[PDB]
């Protein structure tokens, strides 16, 4: 009989092409074999699609459309070099996303869309391209950290999802530590909010992660603050401003829900 | 064809038209030249009208030497006769010109001083006739782009000229304008004393006032009586017409005189305020030549001529529109049909890279740059480039990519980025969705159906450059999407019909050039989702008729496609599979 | 040598440097394409290791130092004046070899391209020099493709210098490729670079080849050939009219073309002179033809606005009467019987003149040639004769294409060679001197 | 400072007024003769409201002095069209614009 | 062609072995095909052995052993799903002490003088996990306070038992049958 089905037709076409010619293009070979695997693994398509499937009521359709448009703008800003106009657009998109009610009402959709990962890599771009050469675009780092702290506070599962990015955040836990008016807007603040008042996550905290913070605090206790002495502050031997903020994260790591995590 | 000779060439596109092919040519196995072709062969003929082209390095008569400009010497371009004093030398007047023109002002206003040098619009170049070369055989001055007069006997009296005399109502001529393509003087008449060249090379100096259009000539430091007045916006090319009486003929000196700017400033915009004379590599000597081909158009205007009556005279009637895509060379003030670039390789390559730069400057949602580019490349130009069958393959691909990037890429990328997410509202339309269209468990055609999953909103902005608003810059420029759909469908149908015959004349010259741009535009439209119902049915019939028959012409999948075409058919099949997955997800949500 | 020491006493290893540069380029030659995958991978690994070792030993700075100390001399003649004549001969070759070596050292190496950012500003400053432009451009392209830090450091001045390279050196596709690489690298677009390139290149419309759609324009002429010569049996004054039965102002996005007037031939050849057979050119687009579109007088592709009562573009039911005076060169027009306050004068009369109309699609016009070939709507000006009076006694007047090729089947198309000169157009009676 | 050539006459009676929309087809050309904008190319009539500062002032009064059904040539000096800054990417600085404008309808 | 694509991808120069979904899918497909699994007859046992040998030949005739060695070598001692799939495919093609596969694997290594293969093997062994009292006690405390377990297996303790077992089973199959040459080569 004839193929009568798209899956059968695709399988026959790929097999026939491959056995007809020795394909010189590795991209063509890869595409054909991916398509063949998709035809023979139709279950896997559902397995990958259903976790990304969300249903909403009719009343929330307009708000979901607006939030999706904002998320699309933010996602499309990933393919452009970060500048002043890009910073403004990303900030306004984030602001619209906070102001949207769906962000609060449906944390599961918000997590399924991978908004936290998008804002994470947006912050990663600037951190990599402008931590060592002084913090360029500080407003982006502050806004991204504020968004990520609100994301953690929305739901416990969002906090657990952000807990998986702890190692990178603790690596970049020296971005805006000495600068004021950025309290609650630094990667250390996001790291603290990823573990704040969660016994399971506090227990899941490892020893090397705490060792990293202890080393940072020892460095702050030994060496003065370069940016403060550049602005002209008197040169004392140690760094109270950064030391206090590291001590705050250690406090949040060791104390949970009125009790002390002994481990 | 010789003088008064009439002939006809038959390429045997229609084999029946060949008179003697059957008796001789057919049995021996010879094939008609145009046997496996779908469209008429483009015929190139010898150009009657000579054009200015750069002197070849292998030219057997003329050699051009670019003498560098030292501190004490101006940059020089020396034209010499290679084969002089030997047999076969051409003792005919040779017309020379410089590549770039001086452009007069749009509106004519009614120790060197630096302020004067900066505020002046007067430019100067000089020509040195070497000793031993008769100045009566040498002419110096300016010409326009309209100059195409190749006569072995040239004199200033025979130059083409016209005097437009605009008059008032009662008849007074309030202005009279002389127009010509040759504003030049003879060095022989400038040599009044005589022996002005033998002791030292005769030195004609050409002075042009771009602000007033006044052309004055100075010879050996004294100002000649002959002068010219040109109209505003006239483009004047430095030109020397000389008949060689010496191995060394003349020299293009690019120097400057007191209170006058060198030619380089008026030629080049970057050097507008640079009093030091310059001879950039762009400036080169060109000569009038007859070795050039001309491309006969594939189609001509259909015009009917007949005698209505003795009283009514002869009727001339043209009613069917016909257009061609014209490529303009800026510095030479010339225009050629873009279809000619099948034989000018350097222009074709430069224009393909220009199209690539156009596609790159507006890449990744640069909507303001796309709006700006809509001025340079208009939608009728894009449509003509997309549909034309005689277009070069490189330009075809470039224009397809330009159309996609300017008008479709942003929304296509947004939909591709939101593709793997299924946010479906729970409405009556969603609840009505089922896995199978009817009781028979037979899959419906992919794409066709009712999909309620949320999708990005498609918005476009009108590209108008007379408004002063700024909200229009966001959103991609608007395009006639329905016309694009219909033309893409008909092109795909024609390509499917023609490619099965394996013609030796595919659009663009290769099967890849024929299919890859068309299939790419088709895939972009499909991803955007502009196609709806019956259009998608025609699409599925074209792709694979037997499988997608709705409840022997072969489709694309079994047409022996190249690897690049296969790579895009894989993308199309991938999108169809994604559509099926989305339909399954929506049916599951409906059951839930 | 720069310290003005004697050339003879100082040693300059010209031949050794040239041979080592050739050997070094061979050392850093990239793997060839026809090789197998494993061999190509091994060669690529060896090349990468060589580049890394050279960069760690800082040979790029040494090459830059040699290039800088060679650029102090502006020409091979200058270098042969300072150093030896052999050095002057080899100066250009050594510069080219050094630039090729730099390109080979930094090609495909992300770390080397990132370290060359500090020197990129130094590199672009010599882009204008003709002896190093190609090498500098190749190095710039190699750095821009690999390193994003290069795009970060590139600024408006560097972009304007790159564009001035096109402006001064002419059309070069490599500069366009460099500009393309300046916009997007590794899938990330630099919007500032895009905006700068657009705003500094596109609006000029003087370097890139401009493109437009032009309506096809055809010209139609009668058989009559009108010329003036000394002692010739030809009348100097002629008159004809054009009837505009219908015209559509916009059949397409471009305005409809409709021009009427007189045109002349080059010499005595019957073929119209000065114009191309096909294209968008019509009456008045060259210095051999003279036109009137209802609002302007056209000659040499230049239009001047001419006044007229109720002046307008040629519309339906318009009468255009064209007068040609060959005794004193003059072409005058009268629209709808009213004089047009403008005329062509003092043109070249060494040729044959004929009536001509140029048009695009969307017209319907009628020639009124006088007599039984059209009835004049208005009386001819005194002295002027109808154009039907110029037909030779045996020939028959007809209106045909001005050019020899028209729309027809290809195999039925009559290809035409050069036509004979129409010397018998002007009958000059020359008696035999006796 | 708008130079008005008439190509085709209009009724000469129905001029645009305050608070009216003008429906026009226009073709924009630089002084050198190069087209930069055309509503006929897009095949859509252009609409603007008199006195709302929606278009450049040269084009504004150029259409205002016109009549219904009139085809006119509008020459806008740089002081009434984009100034010395120009339009980025389309109109160069200090450019004089020529417009072929037809007043199709007033509504 | 697919096995050659995988081999070329493994032989291409990368700093890290990127995860390839096509590879994880097709390596699993090939591994399952090569094994396809109360007293039974001797003829039945021989038929099973011959069918297993034919299924393994279906792959190692097309270059599967070289590809699975190349992937392990390119892994550079980094534990991952790619390495786990490669080890499973190697075990599938090496089950039963397949002498032809052992000879092909030894000959390829001897010809190419591959040091990265053994370096990656040592790195993978060093990266293999063990029992963790600290993690087990933290999990027990988390259950004592009664929080819901995200995973009940406590996989943080003994992170990759299957990966460690597959890694050592691959090396055991490499020496099955008293293969003295490869025993000395290791």
């Amino acid at each position: 009989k004839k193929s009568s089905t798209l899956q059968q037709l695709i399988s026959e076409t790929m097999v026939r092409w491959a056995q007809e010619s020795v394909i010189e293009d590795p991209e063509l070979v890869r595409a054909m074999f991916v398509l063949l695997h998709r035809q023979y693994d139709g279950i896997g398509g559902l397995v990958r699609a259903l976790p990304k499937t969300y249903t909403i009521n009719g009343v929330s359709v307009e708000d979901t459309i607006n939030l999706l448009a904002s998320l699309g703008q933010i996602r499309s800003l990933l393919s452009v070099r970060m500048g002043k106009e890009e910073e403004k657009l990303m900030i306004r998109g984030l602001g619209d996303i906070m102001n949207n009610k769906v962000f609060y009402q449906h944390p599961n959709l918000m997590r399924a869309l991978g908004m936290h990962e998008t804002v994470m890599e947006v912050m990663v771009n600037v951190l990599g391209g402008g931590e060592s050469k002084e913090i360029t675009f500080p407003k982006m780092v502050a806004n991204c950290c504020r968004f990520l702290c609100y994301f953690c506070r929305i739901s416990r599962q969002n906090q657990k999802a952000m807990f998986d990015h702890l190692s990178y955040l603790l690596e970049n836990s020296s971005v805006g530590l000495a600068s004021p008016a950025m309290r609650g807007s630094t990667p250390l603040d996001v790291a603290a909010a990823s573990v704040m008042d969660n016994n399971e996550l506090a227990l899941a905290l490892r020893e090397p992660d705490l060792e990293k913070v202890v080393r940072y605090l020892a460095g702050c206790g030994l060496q003065s603050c370069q940016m403060l002495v550049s602005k002209g502050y008197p040169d004392i031997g140690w760094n109270p401003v950064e030391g206090e903020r590291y001590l705050d994260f250690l406090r949040f790591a060791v104390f949970c829900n009125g009790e002390s995590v002994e481990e | 064809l010789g003088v008064a000779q009439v002939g006809r060439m038959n390429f045997g596109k229609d084999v029946s038209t060949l008179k003697y092919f059957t008796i001789c040519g057919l049995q021996e196995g010879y094939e008609p030249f145009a046997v496996n072709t779908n469209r008429d062969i483009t015929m190139w003929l010898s150009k009657r009208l000579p054009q200015f082209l750069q002197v070849p390095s292998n030219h057997e008569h003329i050699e051009v030497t670019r003498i560098d400009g030292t501190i004490d010497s101006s940059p020089c371009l020396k034209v010499t006769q290679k084969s002089f004093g030997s047999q076969n030398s051409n003792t005919d007047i040779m017309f020379y010109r410089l590549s770039m023109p001086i452009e007069c002002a749009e509106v004519f206003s009614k120790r060197d001083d630096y302020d004067f040098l900066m505020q002046t619009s007067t430019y100067y170049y000089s020509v040195r006739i070497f000793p031993g070369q008769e100045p009566a055989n040498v002419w110096v001055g300016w010409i326009t782009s309209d100059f195409h007069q190749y006569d072995t006997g040239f004199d200033l009296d025979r130059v083409r000229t016209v005097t437009v005399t605009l008059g008032d109502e009662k008849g007074k001529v309030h202005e009279s304008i002389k127009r010509s393509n040759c504003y030049m003087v003879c060095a022989g008449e400038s040599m009044s004393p005589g022996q002005g060249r033998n002791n030292n090379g005769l030195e004609i100096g050409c002075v042009v006032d771009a602000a007033s259009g006044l052309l004055t000539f100075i010879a050996n430091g004294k100002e000649l009586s002959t002068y010219y007045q040109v109209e505003p916006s006239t483009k004047l090319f430095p030109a020397v017409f000389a008949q060689a009486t010496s191995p060394n003929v003349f020299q293009f000196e690019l120097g400057r005189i007191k209170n006058v700017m060198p030619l380089s400033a008026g030629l080049f915009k970057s050097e507008h305020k640079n009093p030091v004379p310059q001879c950039p590599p762009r400036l080169h000597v060109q000569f009038l030549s007859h070795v050039l081909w001309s491309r006969m158009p594939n189609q001509f205007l259909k015009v009917d001529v007949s005698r209505i009556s003795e009283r009514q005279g002869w009727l001339v009637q043209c009613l069917d529109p016909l257009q061609f895509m014209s490529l303009h060379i800026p510095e030479e003030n010339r225009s050629v049909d873009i279809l000619e670039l099948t034989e000018q390789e350097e222009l074709l390559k430069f224009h393909y890279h220009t199209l690539r730069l156009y596609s790159a400057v507006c890449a990744l949602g640069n909507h303001r740059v796309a709006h700006a580019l809509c001025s340079h490349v208009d939608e009728p130009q894009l449509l003509y480039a997309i549909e034309n069958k005689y277009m070069p393959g490189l330009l075809r691909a470039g224009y397809y990519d330009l159309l996609i990037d300017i008008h479709l890429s942003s929304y296509a990328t947004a939909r591709l980025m939101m593709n793997n997410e299924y946010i479906v509202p729970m409405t009556e339309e969603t609840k009505s969705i089922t896995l199978f269209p009817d009781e028979n468990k037979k899959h419906g055609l992919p794409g066709i159906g009712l999909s309620t999953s949320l999708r990005p909103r498609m918005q476009f902005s009108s590209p108008s450059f007379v408004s002063i608003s700024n909200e229009c810059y966001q959103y991609s420029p608007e395009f006639p999407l329905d016309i694009l759909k219909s033309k893409t469908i008909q092109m795909l149908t024609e390509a499917v019909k023609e490619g099965s015959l394996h013609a030796r004349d595919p659009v663009g010259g290769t099967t890849e050039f024929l299919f890859v741009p068309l299939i790419k535009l088709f895939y972009t439209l499909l991803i955007m989702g502009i196609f709806h119902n019956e259009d998608l049915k025609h699409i599925l019939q074209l792709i694979e008729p037997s499988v997608f028959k709705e409840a022997p012409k072969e489709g694309l999948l079994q047409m022996k496609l190249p690897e690049p075409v296969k790579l895009q058919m894989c993308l199309l099949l991938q999108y169809l599979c994604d559509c099926q997955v989305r339909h399954r997800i929506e049916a599951i949500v409906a059951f839930s | 040598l720069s310290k003005k020491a004697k050339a003879s006493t100082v040693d300059l290893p010209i031949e050794s440097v040239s041979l080592s540069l050739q050997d070094l380029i061979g050392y850093f030659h990239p793997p060839d394409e026809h090789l197998e995958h494993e061999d190509k991978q091994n060669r690529l690994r060896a090349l990468k290791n060589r580049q890394n070792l050279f960069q760690e030993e800082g040979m790029i700075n040494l090459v830059l130092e040699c290039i800088d100390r060679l650029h102090v001399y502006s020409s091979a003649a200058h270098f042969a004046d300072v150093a030896g004549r052999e050095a002057g001969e080899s100066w250009k070759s050594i510069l080219n070899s050094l630039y090729e070596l730099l390109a080979a050292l930094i090609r495909g190496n992300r770390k080397n391209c990132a370290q060359f950012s500090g020197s990129l500003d130094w590199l672009i400053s010599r882009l204008e020099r003709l002896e190093a432009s190609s090498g500098i451009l190749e190095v710039l392209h190699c750095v821009l493709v690999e390193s994003p830090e290069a795009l970060n450091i590139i600024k408006e001045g560097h972009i304007k210098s790159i564009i001035s390279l096109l402006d001064k050196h002419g059309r070069n596709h490599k500069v366009l490729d460099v500009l393309c690489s300046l916009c997007v690298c590794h899938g990330v677009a630099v919007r500032s670079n895009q905006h700068l390139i657009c705003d500094n290149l596109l609006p000029g419309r003087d370097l890139l080849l401009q493109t437009r759609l032009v309506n096809h324009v055809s010209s139609m002429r009668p058989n009559i050939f009108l010329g003036v010569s000394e002692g010739s049996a030809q009348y100097k004054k002629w008159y004809y009219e054009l009837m505009v039965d219908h015209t559509e102002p916009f059949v397409t996005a471009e305005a409809t073309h409709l021009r009427v007037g007189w045109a002349s031939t080059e010499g005595y050849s019957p073929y119209p002179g000065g114009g191309e057979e096909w294209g968008g050119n019509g009456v008045g687009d060259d210095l051999f033809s003279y036109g009137f579109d209802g609002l302007h007088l056209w000659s040499g592709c230049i239009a001047r606005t001419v006044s007229s009562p109720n002046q307008h573009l040629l519309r339906t039911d318009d009468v255009i009467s064209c007068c040609l005076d060959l005794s004193a060169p003059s072409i005058s027009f009268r629209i709808n019987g009213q004089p047009v306050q403008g005329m062509f004068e003092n043109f070249n009369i060494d040729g044959l003149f004929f009536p001509v109309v140029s048009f695009s699609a969307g017209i319907k016009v009628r020639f009124l040639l006088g007599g039984r070939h059209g009835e004049f709507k208005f009386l001819p000006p005194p002295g002027y004769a109808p154009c039907y009076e110029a037909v030779l006694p045996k020939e028959k007047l007809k209106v045909e294409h001005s050019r020899e090729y028209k729309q027809e089947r290809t195999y039925t198309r009559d290809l035409l060679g050069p036509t004979v000169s129409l010397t018998q157009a002007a009958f000059t009676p020359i008696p035999v001197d006796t | 400072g708008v130079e008005i050539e008439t190509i085709s006459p209009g009724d000469g009676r129905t001029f645009p007024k305050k608070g009216q929309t003008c429906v026009v087809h226009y073709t924009g050309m630089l002084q050198n003769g190069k087209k930069f904008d055309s509503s006929r190319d897009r095949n859509k009539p252009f609409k603007f409201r008199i006195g709302k500062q929606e278009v450049i002032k040269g084009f504004e009064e150029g259409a205002a002095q016109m009549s219904l059904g009139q085809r006119a040539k509008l020459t806008c000096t740089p002081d009434v069209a984009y100034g010395a800054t120009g339009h980025p990417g389309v109109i160069p600085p200090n450019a004089t614009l020529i417009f072929d404008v037809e007043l199709l309808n007033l509504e | 062609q697919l096995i050659l694509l995988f081999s070329r991808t493994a032989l291409t120069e990368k700093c890290k072995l990127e995860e390839d979904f096509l590879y994880m899918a097709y390596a699993d497909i090939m591994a399952k095909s090569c094994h396809d699994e109360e007293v039974k007859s001797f003829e039945e046992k021989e038929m099973e052995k011959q069918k297993l040998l034919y299924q393994q030949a279906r792959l190692h005739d097309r270059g599967a052993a070289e590809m699975v060695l190349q992937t392990i070598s390119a892994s550079k001692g980094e534990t991952g799903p790619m390495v786990a799939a490669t080890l499973k495919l190697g075990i599938a093609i090496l089950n039963g002490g397949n002498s032809t596969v052992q000879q092909k694997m030894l000959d390829y290594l001897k010809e190419k003088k591959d040091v990265g293969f053994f370096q990656s093997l040592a790195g993978l062994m060093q990266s293999c996990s063990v029992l963790d009292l600290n993690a087990f006690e933290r999990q027990n405390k988390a259950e004592g306070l009664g929080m819901v377990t995200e995973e009940g297996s406590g996989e943080k303790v003994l992170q990759d038992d299957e990966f460690t077992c597959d890694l050592f089973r691959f090396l055991q199959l490499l020496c099955e049958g008293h293969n003295s040459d490869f025993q000395n080569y290791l």
Side-chain angles (χ1 to χ4, degrees), chain D residues 82-95:
Chain D
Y82 286 126
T85 177
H87 201 250
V90 190
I91 295 90
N94 289 304

Side-chain angles (χ1 to χ4, degrees), chain E residues 1 9 32 53 69 84 87 106 118 123 126 134 144 154 160 171:
Chain E
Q1 306 195 37
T9 308
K32 290 184 183 292
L53 287 181
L69 298 177
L87 280 175
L106 175 83
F118 297 93
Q126 292 179 357
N134 173 63
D160 278 286
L171 283 164

Side-chain angles (χ1 to χ4, degrees), chain E residues 109-170:
Chain E
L109 292 175
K110 269 159 175 315
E111 181 179 0
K112 299 293 183 182
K113 294 182 182 293
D114 202 345
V115 182
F117 174 72
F118 297 93
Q119 272 160 0
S120 169
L121 267 190
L124 292 162
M125 293 180 183
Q126 292 179 357
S127 302
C128 290
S129 63
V130 294
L131 270 178
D132 193 21
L133 286 176
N134 173 63
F136 177 64
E137 283 160 316
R138 279 170 182 261
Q139 293 179 357
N140 271 23
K141 185 71 180 295
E143 290 150 4
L145 291 78
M147 283 73 74
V148 193
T149 62
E150 285 178 349
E151 49 88 19
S153 180
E155 196 67 27
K156 271 75 70 177
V157 179
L158 263 171
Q159 185 54 65
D160 278 286
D161 282 280
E162 185 66 27
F163 178 85
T164 308
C165 288
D166 289 353
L167 179 61
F168 284 108
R169 176 84 174 124
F170 173 71

Side-chain angles (χ1 to χ4, degrees), chain B residues 265-277:
Chain B
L267 288 189
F268 301 82
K269 276 75 69 178
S270 66
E271 316 304 311
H272 195 244
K273 297 303 174 208
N274 181 233
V276 193

Side-chain angles (χ1 to χ4, degrees), chain B residues 335-591:
Chain B
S335 292
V336 288
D337 193 349
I338 197 166
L339 296 186
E340 299 213 348
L341 276 72
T342 61
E343 285 188 12
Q344 294 95 23
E345 275 65 52
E346 67 275 15
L347 294 175
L348 165 67
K349 187 174 176 68
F350 187 76
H351 198 57
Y352 172 58
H353 282 98
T354 302
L355 294 181
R356 293 181 50 87
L357 176 74
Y358 286 174
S359 62
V361 289
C362 67
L364 298 178
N366 207 335
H367 298 141
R368 189 199 76 79
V369 175
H371 270 88
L373 276 166
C374 282
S375 178
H376 302 273
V377 178
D378 297 76
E379 82 182 14
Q381 282 179 58
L382 277 169
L383 288 178
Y384 176 85
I386 297 300
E387 187 178 1
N388 191 359
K389 293 182 184 292
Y390 291 92
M391 188 68 72
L394 277 188
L395 298 186
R396 179 168 154 96
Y399 277 121
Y400 267 92
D401 293 331
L402 205 42
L403 188 151
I404 287 163
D405 300 323
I406 297 185
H407 299 279
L408 309 176
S409 65
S410 311
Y411 188 52
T413 311
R415 288 185 75 96
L416 285 173
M417 182 179 72
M418 294 285 158
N419 194 3
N420 284 336
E421 292 83 4
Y422 312 90
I423 302 104
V424 62
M426 185 64 72
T427 60
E428 286 327 290
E429 294 83 3
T430 296
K431 289 151 197 137
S432 66
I433 303 172
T434 60
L435 284 168
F436 280 111
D438 68 304
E439 183 64 27
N440 310 319
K441 303 294 179 68
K442 191 264 183 182
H443 303 71
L445 294 175
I448 297 89
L450 166 75
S451 179
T452 55
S453 44
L454 283 192
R455 299 285 218 152
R457 293 179 292 174
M458 182 179 72
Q459 201 153 353
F460 291 132
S461 280
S462 179
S464 178
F465 313 106
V466 297
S467 298
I468 64 170
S469 178
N470 58 4
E471 295 295 329
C472 183
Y473 279 159
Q474 62 180 3
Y475 306 137
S476 179
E478 188 65 84
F479 201 78
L481 264 168
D482 54 356
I483 303 192
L484 196 65
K485 287 171 68 176
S486 66
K487 188 174 99 174
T488 302
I489 296 195
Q490 65 182 177
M491 290 186 271
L492 285 171
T493 302
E494 285 172 5
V496 172
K497 270 71 177 174
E498 283 142 11
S500 66
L501 295 174
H502 300 127
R504 293 184 295 112
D505 197 0
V507 186
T510 61
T511 294
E512 294 85 3
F513 279 142
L514 161 71
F515 274 117
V516 166
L518 188 48
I519 297 196
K520 187 173 183 237
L521 175 60
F522 166 71
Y523 176 66
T524 297
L525 289 192
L526 209 60
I527 289 289
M528 279 175 83
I530 316 300
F531 286 120
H532 279 134
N533 291 131
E534 66 275 16
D535 295 331
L536 198 52
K537 296 182 184 293
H538 296 149
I539 297 168
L540 290 186
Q541 293 297 109
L542 286 173
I543 286 166
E544 181 62 44
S546 57
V547 172
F548 297 124
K549 281 185 174 31
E550 65 274 17
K553 180 68 176 177
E554 299 297 330
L556 292 173
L557 289 171
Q558 62 277 17
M559 182 177 325
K560 182 65 172 64
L561 299 171
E563 279 177 35
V565 188
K566 287 183 180 136
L567 187 53
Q568 292 178 353
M569 289 291 316
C570 283
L571 281 172
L572 290 167
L573 291 182
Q574 185 64 256
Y575 177 61
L576 288 178
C577 277
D578 283 328
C579 287
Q580 288 207 315
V581 178
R582 175 169 305 263
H583 176 65
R584 282 170 207 153
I585 295 298
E586 288 165 312
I588 299 166
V589 187
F591 174 70

Side-chain angles (χ1 to χ4, degrees), chain B residues 160, chain C residues 221 225-226 263-274 288 348 350-354:
Chain B
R160 308 290 315 188
Chain C
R221 61 154 170 207
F225 281 108
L226 294 173
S264 66
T265 59
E266 193 146 12
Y268 267 51
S269 74
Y271 176 72
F288 290 72
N348 292 49
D350 54 332
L352 302 164
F353 291 77
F354 51 92

Side-chain angles (χ1 to χ4, degrees), chain A residues 117-132:
Chain A
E117 295 176 354
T118 309
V119 178
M120 179 69 27
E121 58 188 357
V122 171
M123 167 182 79
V124 169
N125 300 327
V126 183
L127 288 194
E131 277 176 351
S132 310

Side-chain angles (χ1 to χ4, degrees), chain E residues 56-116:
Chain E
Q56 290 171 343
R58 214 156 47 180
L59 290 200
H60 73 76
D61 278 337
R62 279 149 187 94
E66 284 74 54
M67 183 278 288
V68 299
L69 298 177
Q70 286 154 5
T71 316
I72 289 174
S73 185
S75 69
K76 295 182 184 293
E78 298 310 300
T79 46
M82 287 276 285
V83 173
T86 310
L87 280 175
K88 285 163 165 326
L89 179 56
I91 287 159
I93 65 186
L94 264 172
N95 282 317
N98 201 318
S99 296
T100 301
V101 190
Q102 271 167 15
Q103 196 59 233
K104 282 174 181 219
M105 270 172 180
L106 175 83
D107 285 359
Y108 174 76
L109 292 175
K110 269 159 175 315
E111 181 179 0
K112 299 293 183 182
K113 294 182 182 293
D114 202 345
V115 182

